[PDB]
Design a binder for this molecule. Structure first.
Ligand SMILES: Cc1cc2nc3c(=O)[nH]c(=O)nc-3n(C[C@H](O)[C@H](O)[C@H](O)COP(=O)(O)OP(=O)(O)OC[C@H]3O[C@@H](n4cnc5c(N)ncnc54)[C@H](O)[C@@H]3O)c2cc1C
Ligand SMILES: Cc1cc2nc3c(=O)[nH]c(=O)nc-3n(C[C@H](O)[C@H](O)[C@H](O)COP(=O)(O)OP(=O)(O)OC[C@H]3O[C@@H](n4cnc5c(N)ncnc54)[C@H](O)[C@@H]3O)c2cc1C
Ligand SMILES: Cc1ncc(C[n+]2c([C@@](C)(O)OO)sc(CCOP(=O)(O)OP(=O)(O)O)c2C)c(N)n1
Ligand SMILES: Cc1ncc(C[n+]2c([C@@](C)(O)OO)sc(CCOP(=O)(O)OP(=O)(O)O)c2C)c(N)n1
Ligand SMILES: Cc1ncc(C[n+]2c([C@@](C)(O)OO)sc(CCOP(=O)(O)OP(=O)(O)O)c2C)c(N)n1
Ligand SMILES: COc1nc(C)nc(NC(=O)NS(=O)(=O)c2ccccc2OCCCl)n1
Ligand SMILES: COc1nc(C)nc(NC(=O)NS(=O)(=O)c2ccccc2OCCCl)n1
Ligand SMILES: [Mg+2]
Ligand SMILES: [Mg+2]
Ligand SMILES: [Mg+2]
Ligand SMILES: [Mg+2]
Ligand SMILES: [Mg+2]
Ligand SMILES: [Mg+2]
Lengths: 582, 582, 287
């Protein structure tokens, strides 16, 4: 039973109605940066005792923190910005949340309703700008609609395939006095009538049947399984099917497990891509068959019966055409299939030990490998040490690039929502603000931003946020002085011709530039640099043991390449397994 | 006669066709940040000997630098980004350039044409996203269209009312070999047939007539006059009409001039707003009657005959309905009116000394004023000292907020394009990257970013750009530890209730946070802090005399208020002339 | 009701549009491709494994043929009034099921679908998804131009026929042998049927005749045809219908046959919108 701060017959500002609408959704944290068009909302936030605001230093930091909050908790992330330049600073995070299916509610202040369309001060038609990069958006045109629209926004953001919803609120609506009606029904008849139903036994029986008739089955799990950790684990016990995971699915099935093929795709392991290449049954659970994973679509799982379980009917058959399809929640499909598998256990007699042994041969012939040069620090090794010293229990956020791939390859995530990374859009600058949101959502967890030097500097201003909010955010900065992933493609395909990928100072070519330690010092954050591989273990331990925030500048040789690599649009026969920039 | 690097019958990549298309437009500087979808463009840039790339550390820094380049030179600014997260990082600058009518050409890499619409890796429908925040945009669907589309983009960006044009280039088009045709005609028949014609003598005679019949004429000049400095000056000689300027028009008529009423509007001088309030003839040259200037439209110049000269027919009568209107280039209208005024000089006998004397009485009763408290540094005083020590010849860029207003009020810009400030959108974080672009465009000029602590930290990452490019950018950081302009509105209208406007560390409340000197140190930029008003003059002099970049952290009491202030939607009778946060 | 449609069936959906597969009903097996090629491939497999598969559904076919004899398509003959269903059966007989048939939209459209045995595709030209009245006459024009040696008959309703009646001039000028079988019930019949079933027969602007001369056929469609030099006739007695249709077919060039029908006819059977098979209506009319 909710307790309002206003009498049921007492008129309050629309901004107070909006804040209470957030309170009634269970919101405890927002990421709000004030401006003229949203001042009323910020005043109403100070009047709330249950909602805390984390003031970022850039609205892109605000939306990315809301993402990290959401990705690490399963709850919707809430960011708030003013009109115009505040709203446009949210755009990268909105697109990021849509491509990765992250539940997000973004609220933007807007000019007064009568000023809309007149090129008013700090006016941006943000509803038009963001229509194609949000799951849905709204322009509130009356204070009476605030309870309903906020409720619909949270429902749309969190139900079905999750995504971002933007709510544009004109300033005059924030000031207008009204008595809210919290009993209004939502106006989503089409959306609600097309929400997937529980999976029928008809479809679930056929899948278990295809499993018993197959000899080379491969699980292909992705971001849709983040809430099915227990069900997927039980499913693997009952079937013994090896698990290949996408970038977004990492941790749904434990990485340090015997049946784990780890990541597949462009930078997936040789044995995971091998398994899919030669499988006869592909169980595609919570995946969208993106080009990083499949390469050439015609060659992807070319001799496999493809079972695709997805909550979005539009994804089924979008790129790869399945044989069997189930449109529904993969959590429920796993539960139904687990019952059938448990009952018919002695009848089915499932044993894929011959297939698993064929894969474990590839696993030992072509494992993930890295080279140690003198006393230089291998980035892959630094992440393995972090995994060891944190016991694989840390929440990991990343930027985008080589360090992102190494953070995916060389850390054994035991649970979903430890892995917070921008996969579909791949937005640099995500790692630091995402760690802010993850730490606020999980204040007792070890939170480490494994960042690159290009990605880290893009939103370096959020170090001030970390200090002011006294968040124990650790930064493991893999510093190669380059835009590494673009540098790698220069080496492979452009004869190592450098086109603006060096991030240091060419006048002092052998100096680490910039000095990231002084960025941390500017914000009162203790920091250190490590260069010798012998010193790396104690340096990471110091970062972990030092209470509060900490930045560890880990210098790495830039000639490292992420391996293996299947070229874009290629097949398994095109996989690159050796070579670097030396 | 242009000299290509390829034979007229030699096929080259579309990326090379695009770079040569830029060369044929006279482009010498681009602001390009590489990514997968634009690697080909970056490779082709290294093959150009006439185009230099300034690598920013954030694409928002790239687009804002392109703006500063354009605003300070009259040439179009060119920024380039990769697909997806690179493109979305341009959005604030695109909207900023549209609202301020800044000529800009933005090029974005895109996924291959066949991948468009499939939720491909790093795909954003940027043409759809930016349609409402650009003057025009394109999606190139064939390599043959590159010469024509690039030519149309530069023509549209720079002709008529200037604005940003975005060109989206799929990666496969960049790789396709072709022989360009540089003789293709542009496909803009509607736009070119509606381009304003030279002003007819019919309309110009009527204006000169209205001038001779008026007794209280006021010039109301804005961003449309940036290329009419000489003509406007000659016009003021022949008429003796006092000049009130918008934020965007500052410097079109010299500020340190006898007839200068300085800025009008919400934070305009009392005498400028007085002149417009009681004028009988309002010469509105290159302005758009925005709400910051007019307040309540019905009360703005309520007893004046309004002459509006604008190159955009859609602006004439959009908010304020004029009596006489001329749709054309104000440069040509001034030239035509100057001829008529010079010929009929002895016949017209123009003398407004009675009106000028009535205004100079208001100018002495209500001048711009600031208060000095002990040894604390008044921000207004710091800008006056900078004006003196630079002899009013510096290019000034700003962030957004109180410091922006003080930079407009207390610096006497002698020429247009010394003032680079985000007026319509009002985007924080503009000042530092805009100074980068202005310095690259004007390498022998004094370039000073008068920034606020909130605005400066948003794009602080561009300090690395400044050092690496060895640009002599000076930063005059007016540090009040607050989001000052929002703080001022909290004081006036919300009983000084703070809603997330303090930017320091509440744990160490009396410590300057963050330490901006260490941000500069991180990027090898010499810096200093000044707190005592007695030390300010030598500190600014040191900043100016020290070669290369320099950051001066100027600590200011946060209780300062920008005055005067006409409340939003108010009239001249509502002007606030006294008070602060004390 | 989608949940009740083929509720106990394994659904195989072959469609050339990937967006249709799983749009409303979720299939078990799906093939995105040309159904022509899928049939060719399946026919090879079926022909090779013929003796191996031993397909026989005679038990299922017999269960259906029991329903086919218990609940066939039925219509009632009242005195000498012309049943519209009967008129279409006679047209089927006299044309040997080889005519190209276009229709308007409404009851006559349903009866043209139910009571004509089309032997080949592209004999049936009818607006199904949008269901646009006025389609029948101009569609017959295009079909006749494309198939100048075929028998082309527009089975039209009086509301639908008058919407694009101006194309009679096109038919004459182009000398197209378009036959019009006008099932004239003086009403917007399909909307009238829903008025009878669900609104207690309360008429809301469905009568197309002249209320001043209520028992007169209005308008006189024969004079529309006469205005464009198209021979025409009206038939009212069921005994005269067979010769009238034969005259329409034998008369070279265009011809309009105004077939007067009792308006109280209902299209049967009828499953109400959003209903299930258990809701099928098998009897009743507007009497
Ligand atoms: C530099 C870089 C390199 C990359 N290389 C790789 C790589 O080598 N390998 C790799 O895997 N990725 C890689 N990616 C990541 C990549 O581009 C995609 O983000 C990722 O492959 C897609 O993850 P997914 O297939 O699990 O789909 P997601 O983006 O996670 O979407 C989830 C899918 O499941 C469905 N779903 C959601 N909820 C449910 C539910 N409750 N029940 C059923 N279904 C549900 C959704 O409708 C959607 O179809 C890379 C990214 C970057 C930036
Ligand atoms: C915090 C803040 C406070 C502000 N307060 C004030 C204030 O007190 N006072 C103030 O003036 N501004 C203020 N502004 C700035 C403001 O919001 C607008 O940007 C500014 O007032 C509009 O300038 P303008 O009228 O010259 O039109 P512009 O934006 O400069 O547009 C130019 C106009 O001239 C026309 N034009 C362009 N070229 C030509 C040509 N060759 N010939 C003829 N016409 C041409 C264009 O079509 C357009 O109509 C403030 C901004 C901020 C961020
Ligand atoms: C907002 C944004 N701008 C540009 C991007 C284009 N990309 C990349 C890519 C793979 O998406 O190529 O398409 S990765 C990358 C360089 C990463 O520099 P680092 O942080 O130092 O990490 P590392 O360990 O050295 O590799 C760029 C420039 C991007 N994704 N986001
Ligand atoms: C991207 C962005 N986000 C938020 C903004 C909303 N605003 C402002 C305003 C007037 O536009 O209010 O609408 S000004 C301002 C605070 C300026 O902090 P400072 O840089 O330290 O300068 P100062 O000398 O102290 O005043 C905010 C938060 C904005 N315009 N841009
Ligand atoms: C352009 C147009 N306007 C109105 C229509 C709405 N409908 C119908 C329906 C089923 O689509 O109802 O939705 S059918 C119909 C009446 C048909 O009159 P008839 O031609 O005489 O044939 P009959 O043998 O008597 O039934 C109407 C008014 C329509 N479809 N098209
Ligand atoms: C420097 O000007 C300033 N500063 C601050 C800190 N706040 C405000 N607020 C304000 O102008 N409110 S408004 O009357 O409704 C309004 C009217 C017209 C157009 C826009 C608009 O607001 C939306 C954007 Cl501010 N203005
Ligand atoms: C880590 O992956 C990576 N890294 C780097 C540095 N570059 C590339 N390039 C690349 O994938 N080119 S592409 O085949 O045409 C292509 C195909 C499909 C979708 C997009 C797409 O490109 C556009 C965005 Cl990269 N990929
Ligand atoms: Mg080792
Ligand atoms: Mg790097
Ligand atoms: Mg003084
Ligand atoms: Mg400030
Ligand atoms: Mg009979
Ligand atoms: Mg009818």
């Amino acid at each position: 039973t909710f307790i309002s701060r206003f009498a049921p017959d007492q008129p309050r500002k629309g901004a107070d109605i909006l804040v209470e609408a957030l309170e009634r959704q269970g919101v405890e944290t927002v990421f709000a940066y004030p401006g003229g068009a949203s001042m009323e909302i910020h005043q109403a936030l100070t009047r709330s005792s249950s909602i805390r605001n984390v003031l970022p230093r850039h609205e892109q930091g605000g939306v990315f923190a809301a993402e990290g909050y959401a990705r690490s908790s399963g709850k919707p992330g809430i960011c708030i910005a003013t009109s115009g330049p505040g709203a446009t600073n949210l755009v990268s995070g909105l697109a990021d949340a849509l491509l990765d299916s992250v539940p997000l509610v973004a609220i933007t202040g807007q000019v007064p309703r009568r000023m809309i369309g007149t090129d008013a001060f700090q006016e941006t038609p943000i509803v038009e700008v963001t229509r194609s990069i949000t799951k849905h958006n709204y322009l509130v045109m009356d204070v009476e609609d605030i309870p309903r629209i906020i409720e619909e926004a949270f429902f749309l953001a969190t139900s079905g395939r999750p995504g971002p919803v933007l709510v544009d609120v004109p300033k005059d609506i924030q000031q207008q006095l009204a008595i809210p009606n919290w009993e209004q029904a939502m106006r989503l008849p089409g959306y609600m009538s097309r929400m997937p139903k529980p999976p029928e036994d008809s479809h679930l029986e056929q899948i278990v049947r295809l499993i018993s008739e197959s000899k080379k089955p491969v699980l292909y799990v992705g971001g849709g399984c983040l809430n099915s950790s227990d069900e997927l684990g039980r499913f693997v016990e009952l079937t013994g099917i090896p698990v290949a995971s996408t970038l977004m699915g990492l941790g749904s099935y434990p990485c340090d497990d015997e049946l784990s093929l780890h990541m597949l795709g462009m930078h997936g392991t040789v044995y995971a891509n091998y398994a899919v290449e030669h499988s006869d049954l592909l169980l595609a659970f919570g995946v969208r068959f993106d080009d990083r994973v499949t390469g050439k679509l015609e060659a992807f799982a070319s001799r496999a019966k493809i079972v695709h379980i997805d909550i979005d009917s539009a994804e089924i058959g979008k790129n790869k055409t399945p044989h069997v399809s189930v449109c529904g929640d993969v959590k429920l499909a796993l539960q139904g299939m687990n019952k059938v598998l448990e009952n018919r256990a002695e009848e089915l007699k499932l044993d894929f030990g011959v297939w698993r042994n064929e894969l474990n041969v590839q696993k030992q012939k072509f494992p993930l490998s890295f080279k140690t040069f003198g006393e230089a620090i291998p980035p892959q090794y630094a992440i393995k040490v972090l995994d060891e010293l944190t016991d694989g229990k840390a929440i990991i956020s990343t930027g985008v690039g080589q360090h992102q791939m190494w953070a995916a390859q060389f850390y054994n995530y035991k649970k979903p929502r430890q892995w917070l990374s921008s996969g579909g859009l791949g937005a640099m600058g995500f790692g630091l603000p995402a760690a802010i949101g993850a730490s606020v959502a999980n204040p007792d967890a070890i939170v480490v931003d494994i960042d690159g030097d290009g990605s880290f500097i893009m939103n370096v201003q959020e170090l001030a946020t970390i200090r002011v909010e006294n968040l124990p955010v650790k930064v493991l900065l893999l510093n190669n002085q380059h835009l590494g992933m673009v540098m790698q493609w220069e080496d492979r395909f452009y004869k190592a011709n450098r086109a603006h990928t060096f991030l240091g100072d060419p006048a002092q070519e052998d100096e680490i530039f910039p000095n990231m330690l002084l960025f941390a010092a500017a914000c009162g954050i203790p920091a250190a640099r490590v260069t010798k591989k012998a010193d790396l273990r104690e340096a990471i331990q110091t970062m972990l043991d030092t209470p509060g925030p900490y930045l560890l500048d880990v210098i790495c040789p830039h000639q490292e390449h992420v391996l293996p690599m299947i070229p874009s649009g290629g097949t398994f026969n095109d996989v690159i397994t050796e070579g670097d920039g030396r």
